[PDB]
């Protein structure tokens, strides 16, 4: 209602749950009504099963899929003031994962926040992946790209955990 933020988890273990848990706690302390919406499960409405999503995509019913996601979004965010949307991890088996992430963010008019893990990267290698990730969601054109997490309420209030100088995106938390 007041702020829709979609977390794009760009890694098989980037601590997406830790980020969401921190947002739940920050909002509860401020009395802000928060809904965490996970449109699709990653193997008033549960996350859609991946096999159901694949069946709708297989049968050329992507429109039906998006309608169901939008309907579930509304059933799950009634009277929410902040909505945190949990996106899909791009895994080996699913070539539709990142296109579905973009389509969901676009349809929900969500601000996009990428959740990364440093892993083995050097600082500059991580920043290269951050810039690559931003360009793949529209780059400088897409005004909804909001920031990156590496591990109307202000983002500092939403992502309070309490490379930010040279990062391609503002680093949150
Ligand atoms: Zn409390
Ligand atoms: Zn699958
Ligand atoms: Zn339709």
Secondary structure of the chain as H, E, C letters: CCEEEEEEECCCCCCHHHHHHHHHHHHHHCCCCEEEECCECCCCCCCECHHHHHHHHHCCCHHHHHHHHHHHHHHHCCCCCEEEEECCCCCCCCCCHHHHHHHHHHHHCCEEEEEECCCCCCHHHHHHHHHHHHHHCCCCCCCCEEEEEECCCCHHHHCCCCCCCCCCCCECC
Nearest to 62 by CA among 53, 70, 71: 53
Ligand nearest to the CA of 70: 3
Ligand nearest to the CA of 42: 2
Ligand nearest to the CA of 30: 1
CA of 169 to the centre of ligand 3 (A): 34
CA of 87 to the centre of ligand 2 (A): 15
Ligand nearest to the CA of 107: 3
In whole angstroms, how large is the CA radius of gyration of the chain?
16
CA of 63 to the centre of ligand 3 (A): 5
CA of 85 to the centre of ligand 3 (A): 21
CA of 100 to the centre of ligand 2 (A): 13
Q: Which method was used?
A: X-ray
Torsion of CA 6, 7, 11, 15, to 10 degrees: -160
CATH superfamily of 4-164: P-loop containing nucleotide triphosphate hydrolases (3.40.50.300)
Antiparallel, parallel or unpaired: β 3-9 and 82-86:
parallel
CA of 64 to the centre of ligand 3 (A): 6
Cβ 129 vs Cβ 116: under 8 Å? yes
Preceding-residue numbers of gaps in the chain (C–N over 2.5 Å): 43, 151, 162
């Amino acid at each position: 209602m007041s702020r829709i933020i979609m977390l794009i988890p760009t890694g098989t273990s980037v601590g997406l749950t830790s980020v969401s848990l921190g947002v739940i706690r920050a909002m509860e302390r401020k009395g802000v009504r928060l809904s965490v919406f996970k449109p699709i499960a990653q193997p008033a409405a549960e996350p859609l099963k991946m096999s159901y999503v694949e069946g709708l995509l297989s049968s050329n019913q992507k429109d039906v899929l998006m309608e169901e996601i939008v309907a579930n979004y509304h059933a799950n965010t009634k009277d929410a003031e902040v909505v945190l949307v949990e996106g899909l991890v791009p895994t080996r088996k699913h070539q539709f994962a990142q296109s579905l992430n973009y389509e969901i963010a676009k349809t929900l008019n969500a601000e996009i926040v990428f959740v990364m893990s440093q892993g083995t990267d050097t600082p500059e290698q991580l920043k290269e992946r951050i810039e690559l990730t931003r360009n793949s969601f529209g780059g400088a054109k897409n005004t909804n790209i909001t920031g990156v997490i590496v591990n109307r309420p202000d983002l500092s209030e939403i992502f309070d955990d309490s490379l930010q100088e040279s990062s391609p995106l503002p680093v949150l938390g």
